[PDB]
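#dry-run=false #mode=assembly
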Amino acid sequence: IARTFFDAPEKNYERTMAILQIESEKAELRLKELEVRRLMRAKGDGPWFQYPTIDKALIDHSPKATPDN
Amino acid sequence: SWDKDVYPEPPRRTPAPSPQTSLPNPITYLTKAFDLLVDRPVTLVREFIERQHAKNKYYYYHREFRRVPDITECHEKDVLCMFEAEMQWKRDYKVDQEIVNIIQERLKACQQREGESHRQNCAKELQQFTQVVKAYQDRYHDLGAHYSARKCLAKQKQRMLAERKATKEAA
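#status=ok
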């Protein structure tokens, strides 16, 4: 029965170790994602939460009719 | 067979039968009939089975586990080392349960063997039983159904803190 149907204890042991490593890395990544999202919401210096402003390519720099502008 | 050092037994002392009457006891006749009609065919069948087993021989081994570092040298929230430490702790826990079982079996065997003088002739077995029960209770009790190595470490740390504080009161 052990030779035909059952997995070895060593195989299960190392499979469990691999599973634990993968989910531990995923959990640390999730916590870092939450911290990064909170920081970029708070400060707004990063690539996320960049709400649009007015583009400066629409300004006319030619001389106008009145010098005071 | 089993090992006699783990399971101790005193050498037996059987008195000789010295009858005082002339009536033959039926026990001897029934015993002779028992090795005649029962023991001989049973032993012959066992000899045949043993010959068939000696025709085809193979072995099996007792699994050995090396020592992995325990939970006291494991970084917290580092599952890779804590998993091995917890597996080692659970294996040790099962081994200690069977050790206490062996000592209980020793105590019951001593009581049954001694019979009517059990409360004098089994002092050593009772002392060994008390020692192993005290150590098991100080090691593994009051953990709960969700026991782990961390709970055992916390219980041991609390016990050593209490012992050190009680020493400091009486110093």
